[PDB]
A paper describes a structure:
For rotaviruses (RVs), which are the major causative agents of life-threatening gastroenteritis in children under the age of 5 years and result in 453,000 deaths worldwide annually, recognition of specific cellular glycans for initial cell attachment is mediated by the distally located VP8* domain of the spike protein VP4. Although structurally conserved with a galectin-like fold, sequence-wise VP8* is the least conserved among RV structural proteins contributing to a phylogeny consisting of 37 [P] genotypes9. Our crystallographic analyses provide the structural basis to explain the unique glycan specificity exhibited by a neonate-specific bovine-human reassortant RV strain and its parental bovine strain, each belonging to the P genotype.
The residues interacting with the type II glycan in the P HRV VP8* are conserved in the BRV VP8*, indicating that the bovine VP8* can also bind glycans with the β1,4 motif using the same binding site. To test our hypothesis that both human and bovine P VP8*s use the same binding site to interact with type II glycan, we co-crystallized bovine P VP8* with LNnT. The crystal structure shows that the Galβ1,4-GlcNAc moieties of LNnT at the non-reducing end interact at the same binding site as in the human P VP8* with similar hydrophobic interactions involving the conserved N155, Y156, W178, G179 and D185 and hydrogen bond interactions involving the conserved R154 and R187. The electron density for the Glc moiety at the reducing end, however, is not well defined in any of the four molecules in the asymmetric unit because of the lack of engagement by the protein and was not modelled in the final structure. In the ligand-bound bovine P VP8* structure, in all the four molecules of the asymmetric unit, the conformation of the J-K loop remains the same as in the apo structure, despite the space group difference, indicating that the different conformation of the J-K loop from that observed in the human P VP8* is mainly due to the sequence variations and not the ligand binding or crystal contacts. Consistent with the structural observation, co-crystallization of P BRV B223 VP8* with LNT using similar concentrations as the LNnT did not show any density for the bound LNT, indicating that LNT cannot bind to B223 VP8*.
Residue numbers in the entry: 64 to 225
Amino acid sequence: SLDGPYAPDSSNLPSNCWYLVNPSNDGVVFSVTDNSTFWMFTYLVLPNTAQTNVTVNVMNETVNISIDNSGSTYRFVDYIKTSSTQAYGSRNYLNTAHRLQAYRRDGDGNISNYWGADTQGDLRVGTYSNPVPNAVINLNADFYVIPDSQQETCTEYIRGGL
Ligand SMILES: CC(=O)N[C@H]1[C@H](O[C@H]2[C@@H](O)[C@@H](CO)O[C@@H](O[C@H]3[C@H](O)[C@@H](O)[C@H](O)O[C@@H]3CO)[C@@H]2O)O[C@H](CO)[C@@H](O[C@@H]2O[C@H](CO)[C@H](O)[C@H](O)[C@H]2O)[C@@H]1O
């Protein structure tokens, strides 16, 4: 009934379905680039992490990013740049007690994932206006596949675990 788990995989993934990742380790859990206009990855930050600069290998480069999570939950933090020469900067994030985040690429190639300072009242599905329709997506965790028609089921997992 729940479709998965699938081992970590990199692929030009189909659109309009949700890829729900369930990492057991911190660090990069998701990445995508078209090598031209958009570079995105999500870094899982452990609770009670003092601000630190850490080195990350992602999308054939090695970059330094600042991470921080003084709070008591996990933080899935998105890092994005839109030029090769530009530094990655954190954008949206998900503060959550569960190691679950989900991604969708829509018909125009835009990435959606769950954003929120909490997984209750603040939770929302966000979309980045940066189309990468044919890009390889790296899911660096065991993951599940949920049809767009069952998005509320995905939302329930994001809030409450598998
Ligand atoms: C859609 C989105 O990503 N919303 C974010 C929100 O993003 C906005 C922010 O980055 C501003 C920075 O000045 O830029 C906005 O984009 C504009 C372009 O910069 C501009 O050139 C263009 O002409 O118009 C664009 C309109 O979008 C961008 O949308 O940033 C806020 C934080 O400031 C996010 O809210 C925070 O989200 C976290 C979870 O990720 C928590 O929920 C926080 O409580 C909340 O403040 C918002 O999700």
